């Protein structure tokens, strides 16, 4: 039999073995994190082989191995899709997870529940693999909700902290709002196509209507934190830094984009939904890049960077370039995870300080970290012939050379400049100048785990772009002819972002003080979106939940109409009937009245 | 079917002739054995039901409910013996007798072929529940609760009885097989409208339908733990099962007589989920969550489709297990601290880690995490409702959100944060409590591997 | 001199911008003293039980009992049928029901009369 | 946190707290150290300009416009120490804080490990048990009949007394319990 | 051990009932103010200021530090809404009604400009992309039995 299927299933299966051993003796030892990391490294090495098979012959497969249940005419089976997207994303995710687990072995060394932390990371990885390889909508929903629940558990890792629990519940709330659209798409595809698997859905929908695609767009907006449902990703920085590096930067947050990539045959036939996706991505990327340039927490800046890159992924979906969007996912994973680990090393060295205003000159004090973050910021800004270039350069060219919304294109270019702006902000404030941290200097990056994990993702961020670009078949018609100024536009706007940000950062050395502008206040306070939307709707909903639903209806009026009215009426009737004084005169007078009435009203009618 | 009934009847002299220190052991072992025997009813046919005799029959709808009842008896016995330790021998035997009689009535109710016998057993289940609530409840409100539990039911069921006998005067039979084979349409008349209402409103009250549900928070909050477990897990479903049997004679009237009940169910599902967000009592929150899930079940039964019937069956079983587990979880903390206020005891994950894991799994099944059977039923009902009208998703999705919002809320309030400083009597979890939680949760997860076994006749 | 900050329900007035904290009278000082005395008496009452070595269980808080009772059982005895309560109950309890009934009935009437005309595109719709 | 609050803040205390808040927010605005030192000296001079004002109405109104200026010109994202109430590590280690009474519920097998620790624990429990009644008597003696006025507690005053209500202060879990 | 007369009761009308209610809730009589005597059922319960728990002093030694409550003090009617896992009413650097104007203006401007950009799109000065076999008639769904209208392309 073909080794392809066996290897693809074994790569996923072996990741579950430490979960089975979580009740064994090794889980109570200090060797469990190393065991989990070694298992993930072996899984990555194994998954490298189906990738080679696909790069050789373009091999793709679907495996329907276990029949779950049959609902008259709808068969639900455990089926895995092993197309280009799955076999390309699995090794990238495994590589990033391997680096991040090696990093976590050093970052979380003193945590009393480090074994539980590694188990939780493995559980998230398993759920995300389920999401990526799913062939029907039910399995994909299983992966969707699994990654959501693992995100909830890892954001609220320090469960004695109120802010962590609030952030975890916020993430749940926003992703549930997206789940509404996911469930709408599922119901539509079942009642209209009589299927949940991708094959029949593609066969039966040649002109896909608006409803299922809009549901999918809502689910993607929730999962990838687009402008309507954006605020939960920055607040997810409450979790430990490895959680931010793995889930909320490079792997889980792209899931929504991945969903739109899974259904691109249906989406390319609908232009309204394509325009909606493009506009949502454009406003998202520019708004989040605008918020990033004034933030002072390093994790918050990198999280807003992640949101802006997801917005760019959505705009390249909107111009009908799904393969380019997937390529950007794979490229951005490397350097965004590396940037988060560099931030984590800085934070750990400076006694868990995350504010860039207290980070001084680390260029010489943390040389390897400085080198890695410089290379990562260069990859993020699209420096030529780096990992981000082969992805970002093409996306900008495709938006420039397409029949597209003009406002969306302008917003994308401005966001491209703002990317270099906030990268400059991070580098200038964290690594240049004079120290601004407390005088007891604890700076130490001489740990082999940290160095090796950073080194691995650094080699990735340097060469993966070239390797992956030259080792895949052409899925697109290339833009070979364009005006020269349009060819150089991305570099030009990046240069402007660099120069303008550097000038404004250098003016902070002058002995001049001025009160802030209103535009600065809008940028720093996140467009006031969490100040209004996290207070007004929540207050009104909870207020109506108590005053109207609980008290006015259940405790008052529903009591009043049925049971209290009955009790009152029966009590009054009982009092009226039973209050007879016992005098026979009154009784016998009533008897006479009764006898007369019976003689007149019944006895006269026969 | 007597192979289930007679051992259950034999449970009574066995507990009344047991030694004073052996009642719990004997009752638990033999109820578990009865559950094992009842597990053989799951072999169902497809085409038609298992017709044991003229009196009793088993269907793909009845069998999961019977297995759930027989499985719930040992869990109730396990959960009852802690707070009944100081009780005398005779009153302990009387409590066990009430539980056994309730199981016997429910088992006969779920398998009766004839609608009057079903009605008689359906009412007979009232008496043991009333005695349990009003004799072994803890607070002074229990008496009032009992009254609310009683007259809400009877005010619905007395018209049904009349309708039933009326039907037998015109049809000639109340045997369910005859009723199904000889079914005829209902014309559009006032008499037919009122006969429809008499046939439906008793099961509506039992669900309970939003607006007729005020008895449920009182009765479930004031009841002892076994009372709450049986009231939520099995008794509510008596409504659903009843509806699934009686709608076969109500077509095509249900095509328009169902609009007010559908509106009530959808809006009140939103309303009760929202009520759960502002609740100071931990048991009250669980009761209102039950109301919301049962509203979804009402929608499923009213729209009368195979997918909706399958979803309603699955959701009934899943909710029974989940709500029983949640009530037991709340009762553990209540026996710790002797208060049901949710914010009194906080940060319990620090002090009771394994019980925190149980809380987490129960909360996950409450919000219907895939691939649990809770979500299987919910998704089937939502798909059928979407086919009924595409706008329903707006309400359904909203419900989903609110459900998660209160579930985790409960989890965050009791398990996370910091512990209350002055509460210093929180002892480690007993093996009995952990085993009870496991015996709730493991069958629920195993049902995911074989969902059809709970999907009902329409599968 | 500078733009003035105005408070709202969900963004309240800061203490430092509150004039009441700058216009101080002897009665204000004595009221603050009484508030501190009440707080201190309650604190001593709590701490005498909190540090008691022989105390085991829960220190019952009458304030929590009063709060839960007022939120649950004290509501109906203090309810009075009023035009304000009558209109609010009628609206919030009945208006949504007819609103949703109208919406769903209109949608289903459209769908049904569109099925009758033979123009709905029901192909591949065999599950329901 | 360790000091019992008073009924009100004096003008001097309010002025000092405003000085501290203004300096901290200025440091948030002026990231670099030399610039912050320059502008903090300017703030100190502007603050000393009215140090010797006698009319308390004038001083109070000066404090009012100082507060108004601070509220208009405060940093929207001021620097917060990591373990401060708004910091990124505020209540991070609260889940690792376990009350000492939990040790009484350990299985005897668990207490077989750590024998010396539990011997010292029994010694501490004996001390608390023997001191409780004297602590209560001292609190009753020293409290005016109209109840306590503030939350301040007295020290021990005899030869072998302990300060009343000391157990839960002394047996705090830790700041880094695990 | 809470007796009967320590539970909340009806709305107080006489000054003596107000003094008794203030004493019951451990409040000063000058500070005690009930909810207005409408029919909503508040009864005797005090109407506390509508601040949230996040506004309380975090440097005070609260009996419940996470809730920032003290034992015995009267509890706000809406405590479970203001627990600081939830609705926050803290003062903001920028006024409410000014954040609202800026946010709404930004969103409305973005929506209007996206509509304008839809009206005036961007494109390149090229003609349509051409495909060989009647615009790939058989590839895009086929129907090879109806002789499709010939799409012919010429060199330029
Ligand atoms: C060119 C540079 C511009 C800024 C330079 C400058 O002057 O700085 C001083 C000042 C900074 O304020 P500050 O008080 O000094 O800050 C306090 C300290 O700096 C605090 O110090 P700090 O430590 O926090 O650091 C400050 C930080 C942050 O600095 C700030 O505080 C400023 C915050 C915002 C400014 C950033 C510019 C991005 C604007 C995006 C707007 C998109 C449209 C949205 C429409 C919204 C409509 C309401 O500086 C940075 O990190 C870098 C900032 C940006 C540098 C790089 C900018 C390049 C991207 C944009 C140009 C693109 C070039 C290529 C073009 C591609 C296509 C052709 O900036 C301004 O005052 C300019 C604001 C106006 C900008 C135009 C906004 C567009 C929409 C306006 C309204 C349009 C509609 C008409 C009305 C409504 C009708 C209905
Ligand atoms: C997906 C991974 C697959 C792994 C393969 C092997 C899995 C074996 C698991 C067997 C079932 C678990 C038994 C449930 C009660 C737990 C017993 C216990 O007390 O643990 C103490 C035990 C001893 O630890 P300790 O140090 O002494 O103290 C524990 C403390 O209490 C503190 O303990 P803790 O804080 O560490 O928490 C304990 C743990 C346990 O608590 C839980 O929450 C686990 C229960 C899962 C959620 C249940 C409700 C949600 C609805 C999902 C229904 C799934 C049913 C599937 C069929 C089940 C068959 C029984 O909770 C967690 O670790 C986080 C839970 C988050 C998982 C989210 C799952 C979402 C969907 C994932 C995929 C499901 C479908 C797979 C196929 C899809 C297409 C390929 O700890 C453990 O051994 C950990 C349990 C293993 C984790 C299971 C997570 C995934 C497995 C889900 C079902 C397996 C499906 C197998 C099919 C093939 C795949
Ligand atoms: C708290 C929750 C409790 C549970 C609530 C249960 C809800 C039950 C409601 C029953 C729904 C419909 C009942 C009957 C169907 C139609 C009713 C009527 O309004 O429709 C019109 C009926 O016409 C008139 O409106 C007559 C009805 C008006 C008189 C009834 C009084 C209604 C006032 C509301 C009373 C509140 C009821 C609930 C009390 C608690 C239709 O006109 P027409 O097609 O020509 O006649 C159809 C009947 N035919 C065919 C036999 C001739
Ligand atoms: C443990 C180590 C075992 C080592 C020895 C075993 C080696 C091979 C054993 C082969 C056994 C024979 C076999 O499995 O044949 C198929 C046999 C019967 O065929 P069905 O597909 O079930 O028929 C339809 C009934 N539903 O299937 C099986 O029993 C094995 C199924 C295991 C599937 C793999 C695990 C996936 C299930 C996880 C649970 C997920 C919950 C529901 C998911 C929903 C997905 C849409
Ligand atoms: C025409 C008339 C038809 C009569 C229909 C009767 C409906 C069935 C319900 C009858 C219940 C009557 C109870 C009653 O009114 O007693 C008043 C009673 C007086 O107090 P006591 O019980 O004596 O004890 C404390 C005082 N020392 O007040 C109460 O306390 C009531 C508390 C319990 C009330 C429970 C009622 C529940 C009824 C649910 C609604 C359905 C009612 C039945 C009709 C349904 C509508 C068609
Ligand atoms: C269909 C449904 C659409 C959604 C409609 C609005 C939903 C309203 C939800 C009401 C829920 C109220 C109960 C929640 C409990 C209270 C709570 O969560 O606490 C508030 C909590 C704490 O505040 P923080 O800022 O995070 O931290 C401060 C602490 N120092 O914050 C929150 O989580 C509030 C979240 C509310 C989100 C509501 C706004 C989202 C609406 C988005 C509409 C646009 C959709 C986008 C469409 C894109 C197109 C594809
Ligand atoms: C928890 C509270 C629940 C309250 C439930 C109350 C509603 C129950 C439904 C009505 C009960 C009585 C109906 C009688 C049973 C129907 C059998 C039947 O078919 O008889 C009808 C007769 O129908 C009737 O007479 C019923 C009229 C109503 C009599 C009692 C009125 C009580 C109040 C009416 C409205 C309340 C019912 C609905 C309430 C909904 C729940 C709140 C026709 O028989 P014939 O005489 O032979 O005529 C054939 C030629 N047409």
UniProtKB/TrEMBL annotation, chain A:
Q: What is its EC number?
A: 7.1.1.2
Which InterPro entries does the UniProt record give? Answer: NADH_DH_su5_C, NADHpl_OxRdtase_5_subgr, ND/Mrp_TM, NU5C-like, Proton_antipo_N
Q: Which reaction does it catalyse?
A: a ubiquinone + NADH + 5 H(+)(in) = a ubiquinol + NAD(+) + 4 H(+)(out)
* GO cellular component terms attached to this protein's record: mitochondrial inner membrane
Q: Which Pfam families match?
A: NADH5_C, Proton_antipo_M, Proton_antipo_N
Keywords noted in UniProt:
Electron transport, Membrane, Mitochondrion, Mitochondrion inner membrane, NAD, Respiratory chain, Translocase, Transmembrane, Transmembrane helix, Transport, Ubiquinone
Domain of life, per UniProt, equals Eukaryota
Provide the GO MF annotations for this entry.
NADH dehydrogenase (ubiquinone) activity
| GO biological process entries | ATP synthesis coupled electron transport
Membrane topology (UniProt): Multi-pass membrane protein
The protein's location, in the record's own words, is: Mitochondrion inner membrane
* Sequence intervals crossing the membrane: 6-27, 39-58, 84-105, 117-134, 140-160, 172-191, 211-233, 245-266, 272-294, 301-319, 325-347, 368-386, 406-432, 453-472, 484-504, 582-604
Name the family: Belongs to the complex I subunit 5 family.
Spell out the protein name for this chain.
NADH-ubiquinone oxidoreductase chain 5
Query: Species lineage, top-down?
Result: Eukaryota, Metazoa, Chordata, Craniata, Vertebrata
**What is the gene name?**
NADH5
UniProtKB/TrEMBL annotation, chain C:
Q: What is its main location?
A: mitochondrion
Coiled-coil ranges (or none): none
The record gives the membrane topology as: Single-pass membrane protein
Assembly and partners are described as: Complex I is composed of 45 different subunits.
Q: Which UniProt keywords apply?
A: Electron transport, Membrane, Mitochondrion, Mitochondrion inner membrane, Respiratory chain, Transmembrane, Transmembrane helix, Transport
Q: Which InterPro entries match?
A: NADH_UbQ_OxRdtase_NDUFB4_su
Similarity annotation: Belongs to the complex I NDUFB4 subunit family.
Q: Which organism is it from?
A: Sus scrofa
Kindly state one GO CC term assigned in the UniProt record. respiratory chain complex I
Q: Can you name this protein? A: NADH dehydrogenase [ubiquinone] 1 beta subcomplex subunit 4
Instruction: Explain the purpose of this protein.
Output: Accessory subunit of the mitochondrial membrane respiratory chain NADH dehydrogenase (Complex I), that is believed not to be involved in catalysis. Complex I functions in the transfer of electrons from NADH to the respiratory chain. The immediate electron acceptor for the enzyme is believed to be ubiquinone.
Q: Where in the cell is it found?
A: Mitochondrion inner membrane
PANTHER family for this protein: NADH DEHYDROGENASE [UBIQUINONE] 1 BETA SUBCOMPLEX SUBUNIT 4, NADH-UBIQUINONE OXIDOREDUCTASE B15 SUBUNIT
Residues in the signal sequence: none
The record, for Pfam families, names: NDUF_B4
UniProtKB/TrEMBL annotation, chain D:
Question: Principal place where this protein is found?
Answer: mitochondrion
- Where does the Complex 1 LYR protein domain start and stop, copy by copy? 13-71
Q: How does it sit in the membrane?
A: Peripheral membrane protein
Q: Which GO terms describe its biological process?
A: mitochondrial electron transport, NADH to ubiquinone
Where does this one sit in the cell? Mitochondrion inner membrane
Q: Which GO terms describe its cellular component?
A: mitochondrial inner membrane
Q: Which UniProt keywords apply?
A: Acetylation, Electron transport, Membrane, Mitochondrion, Mitochondrion inner membrane, Phosphoprotein, Respiratory chain, Transport
Q: Which InterPro entries match?
A: Complex1_LYR_dom, Complex1_LYR_NDUFB9_LYRM3, NDUFB9
Region annotation (Disordered) ranges: 135-164
Where are the bilayer-spanning segments? none
Subunit text? Mammalian complex I is composed of 45 different subunits.
Its function, per the record, reads: Accessory subunit of the mitochondrial membrane respiratory chain NADH dehydrogenase (Complex I), that is believed to be not involved in catalysis. Complex I functions in the transfer of electrons from NADH to the respiratory chain. The immediate electron acceptor for the enzyme is believed to be ubiquinone.
The family annotation for this protein states: Belongs to the complex I LYR family.
Q: What is this protein called?
A: NADH dehydrogenase [ubiquinone] 1 beta subcomplex subunit 9
Encoding gene per record: NDUFB9
UniProtKB/TrEMBL annotation, chain E:
Main location as per UniProt = mitochondrion
Keywords, in A-Z order = Electron transport, Membrane, Mitochondrion, Mitochondrion inner membrane, Respiratory chain, Transit peptide, Transmembrane, Transmembrane helix, Transport, Ubiquinone
Q: TM segments?
A: 103-123
Q: What is this protein called?
A: NADH dehydrogenase [ubiquinone] 1 beta subcomplex subunit 8, mitochondrial
* Similarity comment: Belongs to the complex I NDUFB8 subunit family.
Give the membrane topology. Answer: Single-pass membrane protein
Q: Which domain of life is it from?
A: Eukaryota
Please specify the portion of the entire protein covered by the chain, as first and last position out of its full length: 31 to 186 of 186
* One Gene Ontology cellular component: respiratory chain complex I
């Amino acid at each position: 039999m073909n080794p392809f299927a066996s290897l693809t299933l074994t790569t996923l299966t072996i990741l579950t073995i430490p979960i089975m051993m979580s009740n064994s003796n090794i889980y109570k030892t200090n060797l469990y994190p190393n065991y989990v990391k070694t298992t993930v490294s072996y899984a990555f090495t194994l998954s490298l082989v189906p990738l080679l098979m696909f790069m050789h012959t373009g091999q793709e497969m679907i495996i329907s191995n276990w029949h779950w249940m049959t609902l008259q005419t709808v068969e639900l089976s455990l089926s895995f899709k092993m197309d280009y997207f799955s076999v390309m994303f699995i090794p990238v995710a495994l590589f990033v997870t391997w680096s991040i687990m090696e990093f976590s072995m050093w970052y979380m060394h003193s945590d009393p529940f480090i074994n539980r932390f590694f188990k939780y990371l493995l559980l998230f990885l398993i759920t995300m693999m389920i999401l990526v390889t799913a062939n029907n909508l039910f399995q994909l929903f299983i992966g969707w909700e699994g990654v959501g629940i693992m995100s909830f558990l890892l954001i609220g890792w320090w469960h004695g902290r109120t802010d962590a629990n609030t952030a975890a519940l916020q993430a749940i709330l926003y992703n549930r709002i997206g789940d509404i659209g996911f469930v709408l798409s599922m119901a539509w595809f079942l009642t209209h196509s009589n299927a949940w698997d991708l094959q029949q859905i593609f066969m039966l929908n040649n002109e896909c209507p608006n409803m299922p695609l809009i549901g999918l767009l809502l689910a993607a907006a929730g999962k990838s934190a687009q402008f309507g449902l954006h605020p939960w990703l920055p607040s997810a920085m409450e979790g430990p830094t490895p959680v931010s590096a793995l889930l909320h930067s490079s792997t889980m947050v792209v899931a929504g984009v991945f969903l739109l990539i899974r259904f691109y045959p249906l989406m390319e036939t609908n232009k309204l939904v394509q325009t909606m996706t493009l506009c949502l991505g454009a406003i998202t990327t520019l708004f989040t890049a605008l918020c990033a340039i004034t933030q002072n927490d390093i994790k918050k800046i990198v999280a807003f960077s992640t949101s802006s890159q997801l917005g760019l992924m959505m705009v390249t979906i909107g111009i009908n370039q799904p393969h380019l969007a997937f390529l950007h996912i794979c490229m951005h994973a490397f350097f965004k995870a590396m940037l988060f680990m560099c931030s984590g090393s800085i934070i750990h060295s400076l006694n868990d300080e995350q504010d860039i205003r207290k980070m001084g000159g680390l260029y010489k004090a943390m040389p390897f970290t400085t080198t890695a973050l410089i290379i990562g910021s260069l990859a993020l800004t699209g420096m030529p012939y780096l990992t981000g270039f082969y992805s970002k350069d093409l996306i900008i060219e495709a938006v420039n050379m397409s029949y597209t919304n003009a406002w969306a294109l302008l917003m994308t270019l401005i966001a491209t400049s703002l990317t270099a702006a906030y990268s400059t902000r991070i580098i200038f404030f964290a690594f240049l100048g004079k120290p601004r941290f407390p005088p007891l200097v604890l700076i130490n990056e001489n740990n082999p785990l940290l160095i090796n994990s950073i080194k691995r993702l650094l080699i990735g961020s340097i060469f993966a772009g070239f390797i992956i670009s030259n080792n895949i078949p052409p899925m697109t018609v290339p833009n070979t002819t364009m005006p020269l100024y349009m060819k150089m536009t991305a570099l030009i706007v990046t240069i402007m972002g660099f120069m303008l940000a550097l000038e404004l950062n250098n003016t902070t050395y002058y002995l001049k003080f001025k009160y802030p502008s209103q535009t600065y206040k809008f940028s720093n306070m996140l467009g006031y979106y969490p100040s209004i939307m996290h207070r007004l709707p929540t207050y009104h909903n909870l207020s109506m939940s108590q005053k109207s639903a609980s008290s006015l209806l259940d405790l008052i009026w529903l009591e009043t109409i049925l049971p209290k009215t009955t009790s009152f009426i029966q009590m009054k009737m009982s009092i009226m009937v039973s209050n007879q004084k016992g005098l026979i005169k009154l009784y016998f007078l009533s008897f006479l009245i009764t006898i007369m009435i019976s003689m007149t009203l019944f006895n006269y009618h026969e | 079917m007597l192979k289930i009934i007679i051992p259950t009847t034999m449970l009574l002299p066995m507990t009344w002739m047991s030694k004073h220190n052996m009642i719990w052991i004997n009752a638990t072992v033999h109820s578990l054995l009865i559950s094992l025997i009842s597990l053989s009813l799951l072999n169902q046919l497809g085409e038609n039901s298992l017709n044991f005799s003229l009196t009793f029959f088993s269907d793909s709808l009845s069998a999961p409910l019977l297995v759930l009842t027989t499985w719930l008896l040992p869990l109730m016995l396990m959960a009852s013996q802690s707070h009944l330790s100081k009780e005398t021998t005779t009153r302990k035997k009387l409590y066990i007798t009430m539980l056994i009689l309730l199981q016997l009535f429910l088992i006969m109710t779920f398998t009766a072929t004839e609608l009057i016998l079903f009605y008689i057993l359906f009412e007979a289940t009232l008496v043991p529940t009333l005695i349990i609530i009003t004799r072994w409840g803890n607070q002074t409100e229990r008496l009032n609760a009992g009254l609310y539990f009683l007259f809400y039911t009877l005010a619905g069921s007395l018209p049904l009885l009349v309708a039933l006998v009326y039907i037998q005067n015109t049809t000639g039979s109340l045997n369910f097989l005859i009723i199904h084979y000889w079914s005829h349409p209902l014309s559009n008349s006032w008499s037919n409208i009122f006969m429809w209402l008499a046939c439906i409103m008793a099961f509506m009250v039992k669900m309970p339908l939003y607006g007729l549900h005020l008895w449920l928070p009182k009765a479930h909050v004031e009841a002892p733990i076994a009372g709450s477990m049986v009231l939520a897990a099995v008794l509510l479903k008596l409504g659903g099962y009843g509806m699934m049997r009686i709608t076969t004679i109500l077509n095509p009237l249900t095509n328009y007589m169902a609009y007010p009940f559908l509106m009530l169910s959808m809006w009140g599902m939103i309303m009760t989920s929202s009520i759960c967000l502002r609740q100071t009592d931990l048991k009250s929150l669980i009761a209102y969550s039950s109301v919301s899930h049962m509203a979804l079940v009402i929608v499923a039964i009213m729209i009368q489709t195979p997918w909706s019937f399958m979803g309603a069956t699955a959701l009934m079983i899943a909710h029974g297990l989940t709500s029983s587990m949640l009530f037991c979880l709340a009762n553990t903390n209540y026996e710790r601290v002797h208060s049901r206020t949710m914010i009194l005891a906080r940060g319990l994950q620090t002090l009771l880690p394994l019980m925190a894991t149980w809380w987490l799994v129960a909360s996950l099944t409450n919000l219907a995490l895939p691939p649990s059977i809770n979500l299987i039923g919910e998704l089937f009902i939502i798909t059928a409702s979407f086919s009924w009208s595409n706008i329903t998703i707006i309400l359904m999705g909203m419900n989903m959100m609110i459900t998660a919002l209160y579930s985790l809320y409960m989890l965050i309030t009791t398990q996370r944060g910091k512990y209350t400083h002055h509460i210093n009597n929180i002892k480690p979890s007993f093996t009995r409590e952990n085993a009870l939680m496991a015996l709730h949760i493991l069958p629920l997860l195993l049902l995911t591997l074989n969902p059809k076994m709970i999907l009902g006749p329409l599968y | 001199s500078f733009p003035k900050y105005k408070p709202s329900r969900l963004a309240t007035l800061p203490a430092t911008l509150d004039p009441a904290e700058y216009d101080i009278s002897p009665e204000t000082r004595k009221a603050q003293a009484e508030r501190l005395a009440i707080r201190s008496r309650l604190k001593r009452e709590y701490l005498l039980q909190y540090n008691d070595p022989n105390r085991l269980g829960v220190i019952e808080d009458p304030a929590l009992i009063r709060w839960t009772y007022a939120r649950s059982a004290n509501i109906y005895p203090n309810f009075r049928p009023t035009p304000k309560t009558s209109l609010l109950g009628a609206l919030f309890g009945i208006g949504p029901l007819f609103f949703w009934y109208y919406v769903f009935k209109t949608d289903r009437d459209k769908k049904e009369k569109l099925i009758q005309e033979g123009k709905l595109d029901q192909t591949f719709n065999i599950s329901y | 946190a360790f000091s019992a609050p008073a009924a009100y803040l004096t003008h001097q205390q309010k002025v000092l707290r405003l000085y501290k808040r203004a300096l901290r927010h200025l440091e948030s605005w002026c990231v670099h150290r030399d610039k912050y030192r320059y502008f903090a000296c300017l703030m100190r001079a502007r603050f000393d300009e009215h140090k010797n004002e006698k009319d308390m109405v004038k001083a109070t109104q000066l404090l009012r416009q100082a507060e108004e200026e601070f509220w208009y010109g405060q940093h929207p994202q001021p620097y917060i120490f990591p373990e401060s109430p708004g910091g990124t590590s505020y209540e991070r280690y609260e889940c690792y804080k376990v009350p000492e009474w939990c040790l009484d519920d350990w299985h005897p097998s668990e207490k077989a490990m750590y024998p010396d620790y539990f011997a010292k624990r029994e010694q501490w429990k004996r001390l608390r048990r023997e001191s409780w009644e004297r602590e209560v008597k001292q609190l009753q003696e020293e409290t005016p009949p109209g109840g306590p006025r503030t939350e301040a507690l007295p020290p021990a005053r005899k030869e072998g007394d302990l300060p009343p209500l000391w157990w839960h202060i002394v047996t705090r879990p830790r700041e880094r319990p695990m | 051990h809470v007796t009967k007369d320590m539970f909340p009761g009806p709305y107080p009308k006489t000054p003596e009932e107000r003094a008794a209610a203030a004493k019951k809730y451990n409040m000063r009589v000058e500070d005690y103010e009930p909810y207005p005597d409408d029919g909503m059922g508040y009864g005797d319960y005090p109407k506390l200021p509508d601040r949230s728990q996040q506004e309380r002093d975090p440097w005070y030694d609260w009996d419940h530090p996470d809730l920032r409550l003290n034992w015995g003090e009267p509890i706000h009617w809406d405590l479970d809404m203001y627990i600081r896992n939830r609705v926050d009413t803290s003062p903001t650097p920028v006024s409410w009604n000014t954040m609202c104007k800026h946010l709404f203006g930004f969103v409305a401007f973005m929506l209007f400009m996206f509509w304008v950009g839809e009206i005036y799109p961007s494109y390149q000065p090229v003609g349509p992309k051409q495909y060989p076999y009647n615009d790939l008639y058989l590839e895009r769904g086929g129907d090879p039995t109806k002789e499709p209208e010939p799409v012919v392309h010429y060199e330029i």
